[PDB]
Copies of this chain bind each other. A is one copy, B any other.
Amino acid sequence: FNGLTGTGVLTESNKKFLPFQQFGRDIADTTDAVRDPQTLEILDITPCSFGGVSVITPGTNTSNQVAVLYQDVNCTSNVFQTRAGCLIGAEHVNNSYECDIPIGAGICASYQTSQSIIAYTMSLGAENSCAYSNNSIAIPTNFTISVTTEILPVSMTKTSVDCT
**Residues on the B chain within 8 Å of A37, using CB:** none
Interface residues of A in 40-64 (CB under 8 A from B): 50, 52
| In the assembled complex, A12 has its CB within 8 A of some CB on chain B | no
| Interface size class, chain A | under 10
What is the predominant secondary structure among interface residues of chain A facing chain B? Answer: loop
The closest CB in chain B to the CB of A50 belongs to B162
| In the assembled complex, A144 has its CB within 8 A of some CB on chain B | no
- How near does chain B come to A84, taking the closest CB pair, in angstroms? 11
The closest CB in chain B to the CB of A104 belongs to B158
| In the assembled complex, A160 has its CB within 8 A of some CB on chain B | yes
**Residues on the B chain within 8 Å of A160, using CB:** 52
The closest CB in chain B to the CB of A71 belongs to B160
Q: Mark A131-161, 1 if CB is under 8 A from B, else 0.
A: 0000000000000000000000000000010
The closest CB in chain B to the CB of A160 belongs to B52
- How near does chain B come to A48, taking the closest CB pair, in angstroms? 13
**Residues on the B chain within 8 Å of A162, using CB:** 50, 52
Interchain Cβ contacts under 8 Å between A and B, 3 examples: A50-B162, A52-B160, A52-B162
